[PDB]
Amino acid sequence: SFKCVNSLKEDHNQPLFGVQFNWHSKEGDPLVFATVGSNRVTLYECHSQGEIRLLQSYVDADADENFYTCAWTYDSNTSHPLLAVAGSRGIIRIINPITMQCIKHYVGHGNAINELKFHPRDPNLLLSVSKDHALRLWNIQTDTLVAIFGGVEGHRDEVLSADYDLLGEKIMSCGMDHSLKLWRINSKRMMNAIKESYDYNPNKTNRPFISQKIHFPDFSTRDIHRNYVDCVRWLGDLILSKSCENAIVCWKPGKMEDDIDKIKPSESNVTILGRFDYSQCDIWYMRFSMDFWQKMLALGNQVGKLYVWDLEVEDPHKAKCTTLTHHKCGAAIRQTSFSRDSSILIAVCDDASIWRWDR
Template identity: 60%
Template sequence: MSDSEESVPPLSKKQRVFTQVQNDGSGDEMDEISSTTSTKEEESSRSDTPTLVSRRMGSIGRMKKGWKKCKLQYKCTNFLKEDHGQPIFGIQVNMNVRDGEPVMFATTGCNRVTIYECLDNGKVKVLQAYIDPANDENFYCCAWSYDEVGQPLLAAAGLRGIVRIISPLAMQCIKHFIGHGNAVNELKFHPRDPNLLLSVSKDHTLRIWNIKTDLCVMILGGVDGHRDEVLSADFNIDGSRIVSCGMDHSLKMWKIDTEMFRDAVHASYTYNPAKSNTPFPTVSNHFPDFSTRDIHRNYVDCVKWLGNFVLSKSCENSIICWKPGSLDYTDTNIKASDNTVSILHRFEYRECEIWYMRFCLDYYQKIMALGNQVGKIFVWDLDVEDPTLCRFTKLSHAKCSVAIRQTALSKDGNILLAVTDDGMIWRWDRIK
């Protein structure tokens, strides 16, 4: 792919595959698009999941309920391939846009970060591409924010543990942060302060950076922190808490609406290195406010807040919706020593038993999507009063049969994007 490439034309009418609800009595074909036999290609090094005893027969029986018709229907309108041909591990849509503005998204794979725009009629336009000067870099993740005048900023990181801040307006990397002792697996910006960036790493820690003043505000980890690679983390809607997960099978919650954190953030904005003989005093927090290993039995590779609940997934073919403590517990009376949890619902699917496979939610948390290791996408309708009533649509395409590493939804949920292990980007548009 070259920077001069303007756009990729939409599929012809014969190439498009539309959602069709089939019913021949078997159950497996409901809400599936062009069901074909999938072949599993060689997986990347990020797929070496420990052996897991599968309770496949028991889960299939429970999954039958989900095969009922879902109101969410999508059609495949385009697909394109990045010329490096390596796995694309990350994709993120820029949610910091007004309604009606173009959908812009970024992908991360190999040592490249590429920015695209979704046009009408299924077209996808290449806007910019950045190649890291280090040939051994492999970008795993990215996150969108904006500067003081509202211009977009993009953070990206990966194998080398260096967090890079890219300005699409300046068309270059404007900053980079070095601090993690190993690879960075996920990035998230604070929902209320666009300058605060959360990064999680293979070095067992989480870090919060102030990208405006180039300082590391806080390090989360240590004594009671994660005991292995941290794979994912998320801010809740008001930015008062962080939930994190990793290879140690654990999920941990960290409160950051504390006086210690507020003072550290304030100090990061006012610190002047020219007037100080000492480095900035980065705060360390060794003790999460809640921790559990009772949700999953394997690597926990993706976690997100759903209101006051948590959605987390492992390599066990289910996304679990849960909350700490019993159902009548509130955040104020949960103690760090209490590791009990309440599981509300399991969103089950198939053939997703390798790690670093991440699901997504739309901006309004009404739709959830996840790709599996044989190229199929599960889309759940979360806009229901009772989570047990959630139904899903299964999307597939004859030319997609490898692992879908991550999905991304546009702000309104009308465009679904997916990236795969063979360097492909897939676009699906919602059928009204």
């Protein structure tokens, strides 16, 4: 249960495509979130009585850049939080949130970057998914491209989303080819490639760092959705994914009894465990989020209504839905984010507005 305590709008009037709370903020520090839209990323700090305090932006030198996505991590040596941002230029920027300086940047993808995710156990491993049909895993400690996930048996159109499982042993990706694909990263090959990426220092050797070209997923399906698949998340060994068909589907590879780690590349079946329907979300690039504990899931629709499902129930199809509406919130909500303590939910919109809901 939540109530709307404040809203604001950013001056550019372009869509805000992304929002993320920093879940690596120190004890006793105020809750901070980043928004991305137009050619900028902006940080805000949440205070009492609904106050949303504007801090500082990073604004790209290219007026034609459009940032789509951001993801928090921290510097593994200093603990200081870092923020990665990317979008239409296909350039990943690593931003120091304190000063909003761009510390370094990576380029590879043949196009726009649609999503960034950090590995759940290793703050240096950054996944990017691209309009060029590939995913890339980067090590931002050694500045190395560890692997490219692609090929003719990889995605055949834009990759729109991906997610690591809890342990960071595998990734599920999804995109415009209507497919969801599993890529295991705990193979001997991949764990070795990771270990070598940490051993690489271009000042101490002559070799370039060789990336893995991974051209075959460990599972693939087009049997969940019938249109572009634009958001995916692991829930334990199950998958939650959505398309633009007004449903989030909960499913797993194989038959009901099949262990995720026994699934082979040729597996032809999937099992649907449930489906959460909602209304008026027919456009693509509309992302749901979960709280830190994965007890809840929030999604906005294309007319400014928020749906929140309580997943603290015995089976996925028993999820309990709550809806959150405000008479002044009428634009498409692109993404939501919960604070780490679950006390605040933020929604951002196509009209550049930001909406704060307090628990």
